[PDB]
Amino acid sequence: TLLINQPQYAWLKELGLREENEGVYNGSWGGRGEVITTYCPANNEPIARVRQASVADYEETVKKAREAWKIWADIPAPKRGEIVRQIGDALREKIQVLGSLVSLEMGKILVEGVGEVQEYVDICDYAVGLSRMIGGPILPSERSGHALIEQWNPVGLVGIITAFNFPVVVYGWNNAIAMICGNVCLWKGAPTTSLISVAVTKIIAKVLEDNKLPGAICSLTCGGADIGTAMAKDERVNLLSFTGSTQVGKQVGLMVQERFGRSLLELGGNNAIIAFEDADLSLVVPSALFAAVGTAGQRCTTARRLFIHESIHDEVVNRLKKAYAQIRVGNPWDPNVLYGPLHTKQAVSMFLGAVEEAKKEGGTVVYGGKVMDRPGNYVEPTIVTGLGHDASIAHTETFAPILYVFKFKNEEEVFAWNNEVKQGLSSSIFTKDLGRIFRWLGPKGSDCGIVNVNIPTSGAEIGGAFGGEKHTGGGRESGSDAWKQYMRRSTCTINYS
Amino acid sequence: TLLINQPQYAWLKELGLREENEGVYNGSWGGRGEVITTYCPANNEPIARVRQASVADYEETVKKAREAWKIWADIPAPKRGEIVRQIGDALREKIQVLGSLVSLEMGKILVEGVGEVQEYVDICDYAVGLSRMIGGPILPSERSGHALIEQWNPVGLVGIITAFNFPVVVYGWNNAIAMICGNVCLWKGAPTTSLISVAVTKIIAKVLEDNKLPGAICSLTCGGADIGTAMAKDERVNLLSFTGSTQVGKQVGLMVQERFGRSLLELGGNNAIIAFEDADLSLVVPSALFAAVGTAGQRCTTARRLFIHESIHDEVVNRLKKAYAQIRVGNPWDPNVLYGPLHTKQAVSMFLGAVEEAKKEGGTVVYGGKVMDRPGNYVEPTIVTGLGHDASIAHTETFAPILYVFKFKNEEEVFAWNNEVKQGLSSSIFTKDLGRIFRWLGPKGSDCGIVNVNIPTSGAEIGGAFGGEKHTGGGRESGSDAWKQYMRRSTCTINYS
Amino acid sequence: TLLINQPQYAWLKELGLREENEGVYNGSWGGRGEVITTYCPANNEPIARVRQASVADYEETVKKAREAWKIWADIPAPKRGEIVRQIGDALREKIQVLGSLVSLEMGKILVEGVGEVQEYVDICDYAVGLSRMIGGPILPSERSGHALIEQWNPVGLVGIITAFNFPVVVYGWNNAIAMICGNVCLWKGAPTTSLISVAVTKIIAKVLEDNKLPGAICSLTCGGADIGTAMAKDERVNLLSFTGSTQVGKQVGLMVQERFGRSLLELGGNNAIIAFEDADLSLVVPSALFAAVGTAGQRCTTARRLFIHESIHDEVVNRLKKAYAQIRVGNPWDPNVLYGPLHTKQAVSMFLGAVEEAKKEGGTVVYGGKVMDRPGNYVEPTIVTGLGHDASIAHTETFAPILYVFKFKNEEEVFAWNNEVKQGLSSSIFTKDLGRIFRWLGPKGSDCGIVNVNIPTSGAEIGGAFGGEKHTGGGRESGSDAWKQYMRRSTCTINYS
Amino acid sequence: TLLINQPQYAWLKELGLREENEGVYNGSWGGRGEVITTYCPANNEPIARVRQASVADYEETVKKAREAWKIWADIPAPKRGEIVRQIGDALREKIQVLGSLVSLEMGKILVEGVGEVQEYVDICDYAVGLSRMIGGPILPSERSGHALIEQWNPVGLVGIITAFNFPVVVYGWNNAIAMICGNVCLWKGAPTTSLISVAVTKIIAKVLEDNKLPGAICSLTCGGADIGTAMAKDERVNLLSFTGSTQVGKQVGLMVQERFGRSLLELGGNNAIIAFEDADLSLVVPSALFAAVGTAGQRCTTARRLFIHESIHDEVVNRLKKAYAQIRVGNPWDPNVLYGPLHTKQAVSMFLGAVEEAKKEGGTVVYGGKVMDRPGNYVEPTIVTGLGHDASIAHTETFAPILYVFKFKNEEEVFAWNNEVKQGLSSSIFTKDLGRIFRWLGPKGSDCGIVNVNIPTSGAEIGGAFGGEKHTGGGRESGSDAWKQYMRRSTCTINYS
């Protein structure tokens, strides 16, 4: 009854997956911890099994990663970029089947599963050039006969903990950047996307082995909170990149700070869209729909609060309701499907509780609010009106497709309301007003790390640094000078007189 | 009795100091907390009194600073730079008497007291140009009809906690950079340099008020651990820059992380000089003497470990012994005095404690080791041979002029020994070997934030970022792109189609 | 009968000016060339005399500057910045009399003459910080054991030729940046502003002399076409910064290219303002007025073409005609005066010639067009309608207050009409359309070096690079990385293995 | 009789070459000009024929490229990078045969022909990442309610004239960077490498066609000085990149300056290696041989002057003699060979004449100096000792493998001797002395664009900017911010208040 044993799913074997797969890689494949089965969220069928990491697997892997660092750190950065280039090519050759696996194990629709692999490919190609660019300025010393140089060196071992909802590209951003910066990596992915983690690691392992490099440069220890906690407490993990819930990330941040390590935290969001009276409503409505219900509301940048000018509130809500009723629901790998299941049954339960709480706090469900009666974890995408902007349920991140809608009148109050929550990830305003747009970007505007105009809260590109502020944790991934978080700066003065 | 009442110290009134001074400034001067008297370490006599902040003083000050931020953040950065330029000129007009105060209340010699004020003046003049430069790239979006912009905005209120040993310039680095970046500032200095804090704040307050700006832009709340703990726990303090001991800084870092705030930590040092067999000994001997005995060994960057190759160990120790005997001792504020008192009677006792522990662990005092028979807190600068490099007292940071001396044979082991301590602030090698120098600067070299060649561990310049790694806390101040720590990055996409 | 011998002009002596002045400075003062008298354009009265450079004067000065370079280039950049900071302060002390001199000898109103000196002060204060910043990256080499470093060094002697209309700040921009970059300078100002050149040089020489530096670091050789032609052919002049007409600038550019020198060319402008139908007309009209009529239309950035959407063409022209009639005319130094004289008698003849050609080519003069019947070189600011956008006089840069007004219908045509002239200095559109503004900034938009929105074609700030494209010459001054034009880049690889 | 018609050279057909080839590409292939036959310099046998561009072909092509630009400049830069990425891949697929063609038609050995194609592949992969990074800063305005933005836009059409000795990578450098910067390209290669130019253009044309882009984005017009002069005078060519002789480059620069165009000049070199008394001779000897004899002494960066300290002069010369003797001669496309022919018969006359002038000048041929007695253009690599550094034949660039050896004693004189020639391309010292190295990199050191330490004058990597000073022309290609030469800067002020 395992999906991998059905001919309909024989393509899983093109990723080198079988019934039971080793979930530890450090040059060798292993796994002496508990064997986990992962399940397809569209039908609750089991796919295949992964042998997770014991404590002894973890300990051996960290040691092998740190020995491998001695070799890797001596490789010139541009030659490390060539390795990353070859990783991108190897992902390229498996983009369709790996994208299908993302749809199957995680449950986002196919164009997004494939899109996620493509973005990993693209960050690899970007990192190739960046590997010839990382560094600091040589500055003029104020003293005769002295040179003044800013040097950047790898931090060493970069632990990477990733979440279920982007099970390929978050790791990929961290991996590609950490690698060209001279670090080795230890990945612990979400347990419910273990096959995805294993499949990606197989692809990278083959590149490293073909180049006669130690496999531990990109190590894998599949596991749950125990492995993640060990990494947070582990002084040999020089940088811990964590993507997950604010609640867990706060504890990881504390554990890393207690040992004077470095952390990079990419936590929850409670992202607002604001539609002013002059907004192009044929941009607002489809943008709100996609930002709120894309990936069944399970992006960290998912729109969860919609503020509408009172003059257009009713019209936007009515047009949003009609658009919701037209959303094509089905298996995430099927053509024309735009909306798949929630990732787990626990997520369905949390969705139901939020909807209940929203009614108890005085909200009105104007669309959805129910669990769909069908196989898998499907819930109706939901719209709630009538709550105050400071309703407790609206200040909570519920990782489900629920959109809280609010009226406003003036710019100043609704900029404050965007900013009042604890999260600080993404934000967008819809307006044509030149002044309002620059005030939004300015010091009295949005306090988030992603600040958008006439486009949804999701959809960032790799060219810029990605991450948020306040309880979103402050880390940055991908573009701009985000690479500096993966290295250590030294200020070096050479007296040559 | 109080030195400020004696005729020979009448120059203190040029700084606006009186017998009892208000230690809270927020646009108004006050202080309803505990009155503290600061003492002169050269003669153990009381100088004058400061009324410190009560809890209600702190609360009112924070609220006034955040109201002032609404005005200050709307001033264009180049116009903020103009205020910082005038702060620089106002320090210029007081440099001699302010430096004399640093020498009097803190105990460092006059050229370093004046030097501290000069460096605050220089960072102000630097910040003026920087104020027309801070910002991020406009990047090419992958999507037509979209702009992609990296914006930087002030974080808000920047709390600044400083230490006794650099009572002017540390605050000055943080103040000048935070100011041009659009932040307001709240200062809590060391209680034993309270007069210095008040005198500096008097100079800044006049500039602000003369420019019709609210004085809370640069607030002062003199106090000890309780005010410092309130700042680290206060959600209204968006960035806390802390300079101090590792033990206190670790608790400050954890408190700030608990609330998802930002911290900038500049902690202790255990700085090493390494002298290879090919070193120029006429550079080594004076550099080691200045780095070890300067400020009576009370710099963060003070050299406390001296590694000498076997072949030259005895000669260097002998030349250092002869050099130590030549130091001219006296009152620190007198020109041409080169060695002053330790900061407190406690520090004298801890000097004796460390010397005793060094002898217990097998070391030999080859010079000094005793208190000097004179008024004040004067001790002999001390040299200790024969310890093992991992001797417990050597891995400790003792804020005293004690130089632990070790032998070595090969490069690889002595690089490791540099790196084996918990601190990671400054480091220097003395060598002519081209390959050895770049290896020292490389991924297998010094793990410190300051990596120097043929000059001492101390005396860095503002053009570079100043700070350390590991238990030194990771923060950076002053130069390079250190301004980015005082601001929040946003990645901004404008769909204009 | 010279103004400098009249009591009401005794303030000229505060600049060190006498009845006859030396116009060569190379550490010593002199001048054996022809004596020139400069005249106040407000009354055609002679001010005072300046002895210009002979050929021997030029030869001696170039040789002393190149000797001074050997000292100057050895001075660390931040120390060079400290000199420039002192130049800034010395200008501050003389801002009122120096600005009055700009008004007296050149003819612009007092607020702009003072404002020109303030801008030189500001670029000095900017340069101070820049002097701790110039340099290039240290890059990761692809080869193990290699360092790859981009170095920047001074070019040597920077010759600076400047125009009459900005007789202070153009020199100041070049001087402050060239100086911090380790170059020595040689200035040949416009002959009709010789007294301004002497007075600026007196202020700088006293600073150099007070710092015990060779005065030839900032040398002066007053003269006309012969000295400037000599600098353009002089292989000893490593970079020639030329600010002036396109016709002369083209011959300078060729002479420099002939000898494989470097040139920085800041040439003519034919700047357009475009006002779209949705523009705030309460911004358009006063912006158009100040852009076309400011400095009697003698700025390189003066608006000489005004494109107005046909829907609003009549109303905008009517309001502009009414605003031109409310302009206060008088002596440039007198209060509330906004419009002064043209610079020379020839410029008045140029103005009348251009008006007749405009009417010959089918234009209608709807305001002004005549000389003013009063002493000095006063002409009426002039508005001409009815020319086709491609009239020859409309593509010519007449340095007089003439505004050619055109209608338009669509964005693509008017953008083309902006770009169709041979100049490419400044441009401005007035609109609220978010898409239009960013198309105006993009690859199908303005082709000029200064591309403005909702402010006139003038008023640039020092933080950006200032220059033009096409026949404007391509040079850049002041901000961004313009300093690179004053230095030479080297790509340096150190094999340390 | 044509090599392409002999079955042994059938592999030429894998590049799409035939007996007679079209030398014009603009989306279609043609050529109405004179038909040239190119010859293999290893045997002087004809390879194949190319129909060059008539004047009318040139006009048609320019008009098509400028129409293609309106499409290309609208494509977002990252998507332009994706095209360049695919160009790199398509070159990858043909690296062996294309490298073999470079050996056959130009005459360098196989590893360098392959390596030249590999370098083009590498610059493409670099440009992919760069295409997401180009741009300028958003700066803080001094005026409230204003944004200040630096914009970069393509210049339009980039004309590229290249030389025979690097017939692939020089074009590649200019093409990859011009393309991501939004320009279209028109290429005129050296007549004697017409087949290489056609073969490269076939590879790129396929990629443009497969992506449904106009092929005129990468236009080709094969021709001689007539076509090159037309490009130099054509106002439709916004940037002319010229690599070639100093004599021709000087005329090109003047023609472009005449029309206020942009030029990027990469001209001749007279590169020196300086070996100091402390140098590692195990490094000096093979580095001198490689730098002097690589590509038969036909690189712009070829070492042509070798200064040796008196102490080690004879030993280094004697060691070079033995090294030169191990140099293996043969057909350069055979993987055995280390030394191929000169490019032309005229080149051999140059070799002979120079060897004769050197002998008449008082130098001794201690090795080589004669024509090899075999088919092709083979000359013995040559070492000349005894001349004085200012001898006329040593200051002229002869494009043949002649190495002039000179003695010296002091650092100051020999730095001067390095800088005394007209060319300013590459330079190298061999030494272990720390101060001498940084002095060499400083304002009193080497005046060249490339300044190397303990490596040859040749073999730069793509990470840095490539180019020289003085009569080398001042252009820069490939790395750092050289991309700015392919774009136009605008400083943009937006008043949104």
Ligand SMILES: NC(=O)c1ccc[n+]([C@@H]2O[C@H](COP(=O)([O-])OP(=O)(O)OC[C@H]3O[C@@H](n4cnc5c(N)ncnc54)[C@H](O)[C@@H]3O)[C@@H](O)[C@H]2O)c1
């Ligand atoms: N890295 C640097 O830039 C730098 C510079 C100077 C000094 N230092 C280090 O500073 C130390 C100087 O000794 P010190 O006694 O002044 O340090 P300290 O930790 O005792 O006190 C420094 C500051 O922290 C305050 N403070 C004390 N307890 C606090 C608490 N619980 N919560 C918040 N604030 C508290 C103090 O009142 C004081 O202002 C040395 O260890 C030195 O190496 C580092």
